[PDB]
């Protein structure tokens, strides 16, 4: 007997057909457009979207006044509009089935750093976040997969210790200054 917890789960699904040309092209389009590292990030976002769709599809078979349908559907919709994937105007259970993978990929911190102009390209945004240059509110965030909530969008600064936003030159600049 141990005080440890063995609860864990896989966060992606490997596709059934490994060599579908259209699937490969679409996944490469997503990777290139959003600057992802491998197909596992695409499959992870696919898995989260599939689980959300599955919950919505199950809740849509219940009666429209079933208290569990009301509670759980309202919670799911509030969560979906919290991270900005779903517009609050479209807050019915049937609009969850209309969401795409790119809506969830848009909310990534990599995409948001690229969009807010802190980076010149999406890959630059990835290397920026991974190099402790980007902070959300007051917290330095190293994870490009960080899904930014709506209330957190307005606060994505350039860190208070990063050379680009905080005012301490890095190793390269300091060495070049010491050369002269």
């Amino acid at each position: 007997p141990v005080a440890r917890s063995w609860v864990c789960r896989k966060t992606y699904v490997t596709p059934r057909r490994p060599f579908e040309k259209s699937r490969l092209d679409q996944e490469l389009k997503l990777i290139g457009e959003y600057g992802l590292r491998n197909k596992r990030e695409v499959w992870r976002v696919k898995f989260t979207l599939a689980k959300i769709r599955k919950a919505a599809r199950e809740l849509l078979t219940l009666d429209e006044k079933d208290p569990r349908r009301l509670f759980e559907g309202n919670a799911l919709l509030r969560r979906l509009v919290r991270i900005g994937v779903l517009d609050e105007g479209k807050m019915k259970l049937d609009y969850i089935l209309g969401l795409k993978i790119e809506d969830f990929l848009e909310r990534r911190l990599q995409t948001q750093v690229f969009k807010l102009g802190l980076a010149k390209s999406i890959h630059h945004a990835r290397v920026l976040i991974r190099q402790r240059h980007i902070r959300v509110r007051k917290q330095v965030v190293n994870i490009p997969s960080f899904i930014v909530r709506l209330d957190s969008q307005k606060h994505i600064d350039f860190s208070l210790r990063s050379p680009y936003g905080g005012g301490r030159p890095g190793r390269v600049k300091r060495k070049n200054a010491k050369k002269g």
């Binding site: 402790r132 902070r135 007051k138 917290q139 330095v140 190293n142 208070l160 210790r161």
Partner: protein, 124 residues
């Protein structure tokens, strides 16, 4: 900037004769503040001696902003020596642990198990 101390979840525990609190330490560009400096700061903040203030469990947040730990200010030093874990006392030089390892004690006990009477004192 300089180091700042706040005490989040302050409580007065009369049952152990102390005040227990959660300590937030703002050190925006420094290493995690040594426990001794935090103890001096708490002594200044609470108008007492830093010898009745025991602080522990300090975790620094990712990114280097602040540190969060627990602290306890005792009513007196004897109440501290009575209510404190021995290791937190030894961190102040008020307690010294035994030198022998577990193995030595266990083998000595089993050796004495094989003799009867005052000869037990003659083992080891």
């Amino acid at each position: 900037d300089t180091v700042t101390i706040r005490t989040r979840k302050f409580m007065t525990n009369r049952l152990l004769q102390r005040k227990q609190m959660v300590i937030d330490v703002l050190h925006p560009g420094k290493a995690t503040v040594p426990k001794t400096e935090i103890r001096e700061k708490l002594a200044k903040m609470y108008k007492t001696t830093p010898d009745v203030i025991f602080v522990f469990g300090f975790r620094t947040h990712f990114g280097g902003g602040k540190t969060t730990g627990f602290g306890m200010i005792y009513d007196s030093l004897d109440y501290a020596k009575k209510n404190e874990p021995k290791h937190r006392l030894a961190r102040h030089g008020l307690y010294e642990k035994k030198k022998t390892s577990r193995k030595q004690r266990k083998e000595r006990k089993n050796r004495m198990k094989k003799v009867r009477g005052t000869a037990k004192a003659n083992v080891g």
